[PDB]
Design a protein around this ligand. Structure first.
Ligand code: QTX
Length: 268
């Protein structure tokens, strides 16, 4: 993993928290903006193994839709994981702050990118376990990069909740939920239902209703991500292929799924 000298890093502002340290925005000289996760004095052996292990896995990833590791500081303390900086931040907040501002084709493009990143992770034998819009970063080209900021009942497949079976197929369930987040501009899955009410609804066969203005093909795809039987869900290769074909024949997205009105307004 590329080792960066501390003199090349300037931490500027705190942007969040890590396992045993803080996360910062800063600048890297070689200035490019970067995000910086630190491991502070007193960290345990297990925290060090997990921190350096995370850096090592991130260093093996090279994909347009996966956050890119700039380097690591391991030879000096505090230790640091340094990534590219994504100007538009996390996707859930981004869409909530830009409600209605994008075209259907732009939104589906986002999903294609997320799906390509997930196909790569799954092929690399990396199970994400926490896929949600809050863990996707957006750059100034609208490119979505799968990330993981650490800690999700509403996003998690039934077998993962029930007996802790996390696989790329439970990640597919989560991707379905991410599709719904994107097409709703960041609505909260299942709205005010409690965690127990969500699981009961899922077990009894209910599923999230179609978003407003949602292409029929897109709702059909998210519905197939939520099959109870794990083996029946599409693989990420299937998802990428479908999304790529829909984008390349964009008239395919003009057919919309019926939106079930929660409210009726009667006017003459
Ligand atoms: C520094 C860093 C370290 C680790 C990871 C990461 O994704 N690790 C990872 C991903 C995979 Cl797919 C697999 C495995 Cl093994 C590990 C990401 C970053 N970078 C960012 N993080 C945050 C941030 C904010 C608040 C709280 N925590 C983080 N904001 C950012 C970043 C870039 N731009 N912005 C606005």
């Amino acid at each position: 993993t590329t080792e960066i000298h501390p003199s090349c890093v300037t931490r500027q502002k705190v942007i969040g928290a890590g396992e045993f340290g803080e996360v910062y925005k800063g600048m890297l000289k070689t200035e490019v903006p970067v995000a910086i996760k630190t491991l502070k004095a007193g960290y345990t052996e297990k925290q060090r193994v997990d921190f350096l292990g995370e850096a090592g896995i991130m260093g093996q990833f090279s994909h347009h839709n996966i956050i890119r590791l700039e380097g690591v500081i391991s030879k000096y303390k505090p230790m640091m994981i340094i990534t590219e900086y994504m100007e538009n931040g996390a996707l859930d907040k981004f869409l909530r702050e830009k409600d209605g501002e994008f075209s259907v084709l732009q939104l589906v493009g986002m999903l294609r990118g997320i799906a390509a990143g997930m196909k790569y992770l799954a092929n690399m034998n990396y199970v994400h376990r926490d896929l949600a819009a809050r863990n996707i970063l957006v750059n100034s080209n609208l490119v979505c990069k799968v990330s993981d900021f650490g800690l999700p009942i509403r996003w998690t497949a039934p077998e993962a909740i029930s007996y802790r079976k996390f696989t790329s197929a439970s990640d597919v369930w989560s991707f379905g939920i991410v599709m719904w987040e994107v097409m709703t501009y960041g609505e909260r899955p299942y709205w005010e239902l409690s965690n127990h009410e969500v699981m009961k609804a899922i077990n009894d066969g209910f599923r999230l209703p179609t978003p407003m203005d949602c292409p029929s093909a897109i709702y059909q795809l998210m519905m197939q991500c939520w099959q109870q039987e794990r083996a029946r869900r599409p693989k990420f290769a299937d998802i990428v292929s479908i999304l790529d074909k829909l984008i390349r024949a964009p008239d395919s997205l003009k057919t919309l799924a019926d939106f079930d009105p929660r409210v009726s307004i009667r006017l003459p």
